Design a protein around this ligand. Structure first.
Ligand SMILES: OC[C@H]1O[C@H](O)[C@@H](O)[C@@H](O)[C@@H]1O
Ligand SMILES: OC[C@H]1O[C@H](O)[C@@H](O)[C@@H](O)[C@@H]1O
Ligand SMILES: [Ca+2]
Ligand SMILES: [Ca+2]
Ligand SMILES: [Ca+2]
Ligand SMILES: [Ca+2]
Ligand SMILES: [Ca+2]
Ligand SMILES: [Ca+2]
Lengths: 141, 141
């Protein structure tokens, strides 16, 4: 039994939804936020990841459905303070899974976090021009 | 863990919330629907009851908070077709638990369904001027 809205998947205290469409981090951020609902205090946002179980759940959900090589935008960013990656949903950043050599802020223009499709979804920072698939998460505040 | 909004209780694939405020059926209906979230296709509505288990869950939840002698509005009414009760949430009436001699359309003016506080919540029809406590339910449409 779960109480997730239709088309959303239950794990723990949260609901998740994969969108199999290439888009920019900024557009994915709006798309996710667009599912919020103030009357039930539901905040929707890009996924934030807080444990190895949450990382795997999200990665396997994604790859269960998308077998193309490519990346998955997450809610991790350093736009407002270069070098300090935080979550858009305001949750704490205890869990990290950086790919080797990442984050590298490559050409001083990478502020937006994404899973790779390899190494269990190891993270990369990428640019505002780049495109990827995305995943949203509900928080019941 | 569940995926209900804060202050709503999870049971099966639904969430429930009791409001310990005496009001009319029409205003209870209004208040419940007010929580709906079209961005997530979440209907909030007066509770509909589809089994003994649902009945008992509802009755026990209510009577754990409210010890007063009185009734509980549910989403059952026969305004449009006298004698042919329907649920406001559009679900079909299968299960019924009418108290003895109900529905009796007393004084030709009882169109609104409610639990009694006795006999496991057996149902009565009452009028548009009557007042009762109310319970809302989320449906993930
Ligand atoms: O992998 C090294 C480098 O590769 C590309 O230039 C981009 O994906 C970068 O974000 C990444 O850091
Ligand atoms: O009128 C309120 C209530 O009065 C009595 O309890 C019964 O006649 C019920 O059928 C009726 O609905
Ligand atoms: Ca920067
Ligand atoms: Ca950066
Ligand atoms: Ca990088
Ligand atoms: Ca009537
Ligand atoms: Ca009637
Ligand atoms: Ca009656």
């Amino acid at each position: 039994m779960n109480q997730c809205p239709t088309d959303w998947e239950a794990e723990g205290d949260h609901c998740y939804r994969f969108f199999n469409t290439l888009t920019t981090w900024e557009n994915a951020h709006h798309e996710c936020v667009s599912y919020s609902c103030s009357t039930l205090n539901v905040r929707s946002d890009l996924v934030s990841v807080h444990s190895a179980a949450e990382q795997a759940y999200v990665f396997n959900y994604w790859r269960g459905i998308d077998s193309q090589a490519g990346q998955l935008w997450i809610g991790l960013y350093d736009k407002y303070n270069e070098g300090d990656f935080i979550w858009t949903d305001g949750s704490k950043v205890g869990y990290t899974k950086w790919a080797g050599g990442e984050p590298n802020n490559h050409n001083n223009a990478e502020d937006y976090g994404q899973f790779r499709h390899t190494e269990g979804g190891a993270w990369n920072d990428n640019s505002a021009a780049a495109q990827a698939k995305y995943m949203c998460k509900l928080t019941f505040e």
